[PDB]
Every structure is written in C-alpha cells, then in structure tokens.
Amino acid sequence: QIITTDNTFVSGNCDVVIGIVNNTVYDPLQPELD
Amino acid sequence: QIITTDNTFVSGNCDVVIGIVNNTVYDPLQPELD
C-alpha cells in the first residue's frame, strides 16, 4: 500500500525509535484542496 | 449504514471481481466542501 495517514498513526518524536527511516506520507486531503 | 469511503476500502477494479454490483458511494468530504 502507498504510505499515507490512512494506514499510519503518529506517536512521539523520531529520535526515540531505533532504526527509524524517512519517507513521504501523503495526505489525501492536500490534493483535494477543499 | 450508508456506504462511504471511511467504512469501505478499495483494491483493484471491478471487472475481474466476481459478482460485484455497481452502487453509489458517497465521500463525506464533498458535501462539507460544497
């Protein structure tokens, strides 16, 4: 699946996780631009 | 319940999916953006 807010949830800042990596997390609302 | 994008997930087109029937699916964002 494409990585977005739909299939992921946030928890804390990034320095507390060992082995964390970076990648885009698209928000479907942005293209809508309602 | 009324079929909406929140309670339904999607995977693939409805050609090879056996028995699929076409029905309206309403996105809650569109009425709010009207």
Ligand SMILES: *[C@@H]1O[C@H](CO)[C@@H](O)[C@H](O)[C@H]1NC(C)=O
């Ligand atoms: C993710 O990006 C932040 C900010 O650009 C950076 O500080 C961090 O090192 C990056 N993490 C990885 C795993 O590349």
Ligand SMILES: *[C@@H]1O[C@H](CO)[C@@H](O)[C@H](O)[C@H]1NC(C)=O
């Ligand atoms: C449902 O059953 C009928 C009667 O056995 C059959 O003609 C039809 O093809 C079946 N539909 C599916 C999608 O299997």
